[PDB]
Design a protein around this ligand. Sequence first.
Ligand SMILES: *Cc1c(COP(=O)(O)O)cnc(C)c1O
Ligand SMILES: *Cc1c(COP(=O)(O)O)cnc(C)c1O
Ligand SMILES: NCC1(CC(=O)O)CCCCC1
Ligand SMILES: NCC1(CC(=O)O)CCCCC1
Ligand SMILES: [Mg+2]
Lengths: 358, 356
Amino acid sequence: VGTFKAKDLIVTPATILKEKPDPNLVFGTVFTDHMLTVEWSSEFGWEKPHIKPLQNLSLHPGSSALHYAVELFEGLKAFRGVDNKIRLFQPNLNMDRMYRSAVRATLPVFDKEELLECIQQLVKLDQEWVPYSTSASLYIRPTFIGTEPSLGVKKPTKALLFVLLSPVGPYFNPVSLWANPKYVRAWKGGTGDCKMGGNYGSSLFAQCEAVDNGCQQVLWLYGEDHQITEVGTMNLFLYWINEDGEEELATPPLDGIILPGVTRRCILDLAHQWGEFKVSERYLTMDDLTTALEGNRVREMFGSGTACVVCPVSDILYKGETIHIPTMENGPKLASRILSKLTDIQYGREERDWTIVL
Amino acid sequence: TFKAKDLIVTPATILKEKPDPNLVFGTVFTDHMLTVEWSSEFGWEKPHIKPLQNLSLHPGSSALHYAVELFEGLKAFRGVDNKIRLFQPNLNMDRMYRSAVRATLPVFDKEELLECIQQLVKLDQEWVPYSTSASLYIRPTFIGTEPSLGVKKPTKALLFVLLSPVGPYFNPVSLWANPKYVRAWKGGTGDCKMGGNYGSSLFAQCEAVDNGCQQVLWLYGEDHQITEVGTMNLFLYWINEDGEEELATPPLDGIILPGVTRRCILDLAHQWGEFKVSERYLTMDDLTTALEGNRVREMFGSGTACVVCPVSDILYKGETIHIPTMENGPKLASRILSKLTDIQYGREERDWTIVL
Ligand SMILES: *Cc1c(COP(=O)(O)O)cnc(C)c1O
Ligand SMILES: *Cc1c(COP(=O)(O)O)cnc(C)c1O
Ligand SMILES: NCC1(CC(=O)O)CCCCC1
Ligand SMILES: NCC1(CC(=O)O)CCCCC1
Ligand SMILES: [Mg+2]
């Protein structure tokens, strides 16, 4: 029972550094010169955190992360603002979610402040990788895995916490969605509300089946009434005129099968803040969708996430039929506004608690 | 696909001493392992049988981030005639292959993989315990080693096999039944040995442990269907609602993993023909109602690690529900255990075993 502390950081600089890429960058493909690694054991607990040259992990073949998916991750960004100050966006929320995930995965808890500071140091050393752009950023990937060498399924007595850095650009460009009720992403009583690796491996089949039909992503449906939950691995937002005739920004509620995105939260806070229209966390089914469509009640639909921020949807292939979404034929005003707002806050073109400097 | 004919063998320079057959499941490993690299641009590399060593993986490998991984479990047994046998190995190759497809991992020639495994076990054959109550556990593992963080079909992967001598896993177990957690769901992948299905079980499993139990009784649906005993297929031996003696186990509707042991037990039950054999749904209420009527005789889980694992108690709604398995023999559990072990250790010759 304890934690590692940033003041104990053991930094080992890379002798040979790599050349930065061109800001104009396939997501998660390029990695910086250094990484963060912290060992753990139930015997001695957390060791001293290390910032060393990016290298391969040396894992026992029996590591529980390779057999029973004892792992979890996070994804946040650092932005080199217009005032050229490197900033983090709502990092503390990422530390809160990662912690909640480590517990749900039975992985060893840690001090969020210490980790966030270790991440600060790691990004500081490689601050030059933070894209000298305004449409690019630095992707931060915290990863927690069980390295228990035994094959028995149980709480790991060994784990490794690491952080990778990758400069990224994009990921508008409306997307087509593949809606097949035969596949379910999360279930009540499952781990769909956590960022645990196990919830992602089983979706590759659906994804491939998605591209096989010109769709860039999967629209995850759930239950008898086919509630629409998430766009691929992005939270789903629906801007429309509800059943009562009111202008509304809707999104599925956090009832266990939806991941509580940091971007989802921010979009909700902004929406409430403006008070220009009803904001509701409610259930949305395909029928609610189609009925609204054949009434011209829909305006926009988009997914939200750290990677895309705001990703417009234009089509849903459902029951062998392409259902068009007027998202683009309506601006998308709401979606563009939200992008500007967050972008302004991310790159320093506007002050707000949501960001941190260093 | 890789060919067993291209195996590159690098024997360990120093051999480890064999453990006492005592043995804690999957904690001791043999001298060698099988590794086969795959890439999207070149396909499979040649298979390597080399000394047990750590895996050097790029920190971005999808197996660490998105659970792009699956695994298998089977055993080698030293016969009473000293012949080492594999039990239904081709069924594991089949299941592993199906899982590979559902996981979007590269396909391989089932027969070639088996031959590579046979050769690995042959090299470390002295590890196959000289006991009729111990065996050599075989762990084929398939992981995606895609370097990029984008979520997609891997362009790089690794297939490896570890060997581990093991003893047990009748020590009746008590199960913890809490509907709040769900092992797998319709539309899911609970019918595959993909890593993802296990990581989410640890929280419930630990809750079962600090609550006086050793395994989780996985419940599903509004009517609380009893699906599996921990990660072992569930069997109920009783007199059903029609008053018929019956051996029942949940149907393969998608939330149940098709265990080889499960299929074998059903096979044996059907051929003995001494009672009704049913692949059907079983709910906590069917169970409790049956207990009150004294219709339950036995309950046990089945799996490679524990061929037959009897259940004695179930903590359900704030109460401990006793299952009379042990005071009923357990006649059928024993008979079944006896039969299967006799086949595995060669006391009986059957097509379910492959020698050397
Ligand atoms: C990571 C993730 C999101 C988005 O969360 P953000 O913190 O907003 O990046 C949404 N859905 C799923 C399933 C996710 O894994
Ligand atoms: C492996 C496994 C079983 C048992 O299958 P066998 O082929 O008999 O070893 C049962 N349930 C789950 C969830 C499993 O992973
Ligand atoms: N849809 C993508 C992410 C989330 C996001 O940033 O929207 C989750 C899977 C791993 C890559 C990131
Ligand atoms: N219940 C156990 C296993 C199966 C078995 O052999 O019963 C699956 C999880 C990994 C260890 C093996
Ligand atoms: Mg062939």
